[PDB]
User: Fold 2''-aminoglycoside nucleotidyltransferase from Klebsiella pneumoniae.
Amino acid sequence: TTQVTLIHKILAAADERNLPLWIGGGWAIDARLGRVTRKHDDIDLTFPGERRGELEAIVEMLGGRVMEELDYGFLAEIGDELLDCEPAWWADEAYEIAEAPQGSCPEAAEGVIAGRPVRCNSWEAIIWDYFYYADEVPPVDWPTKHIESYRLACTSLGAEKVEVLRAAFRSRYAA
Ligand SMILES: NC[C@H]1O[C@H](O[C@H]2[C@H](O)[C@@H](O[C@H]3O[C@H](CO)[C@@H](O)[C@H](N)[C@H]3O)[C@H](N)C[C@@H]2N)[C@H](O)[C@@H](O)[C@@H]1O
Ligand SMILES: [Mg+2]
Ligand SMILES: [Mg+2]
Assistant:
């Protein structure tokens, strides 16, 4: 239960600060489904970019530290667990992940992890990131756990919507 216990600790500390945080990536899939479906390599979080200091304070207060600074965000470690953190920026009516489809950070808690309601990135935002991944690593070459998580997200959003979103991504990044 270590990752779930950590997620609950991180979100309790964020709630106390009125700091919204969105579960992303694998755990966001499981949160929207309301079921734990696999072992997760890390915990992905999306945070208000202008409030980054408050997230780092939560990390430090849990005994962790910022471990690596990335082009898109940062990685922090709390004990043996990894947090993969990406900023979202206020766009008049909601926070949005840069370059992602609108609605990437919904206001309402739309997922559940071990009985706790949680904010989590939208299905479109989740799936969008696999498109980047497919440009970096041929899907035929993906580790099976990513093929399976992608297919689960696609089943949940629906093939029609996914085909449309993929086409939008291709048009966005077409030469
Ligand atoms: N919004 C724009 C950004 O969107 C994607 O970035 C995503 C990262 O790729 C994810 O991180 C993954 O990749 C890391 C580096 O390989 C791994 O350490 C990590 N465990 C993986 O989950 C992270 N969780 C979400 C983030 N949206 C693109 O790729 C990036 O170019 C683009 O600027
Ligand atoms: Mg992850
Ligand atoms: Mg990750």
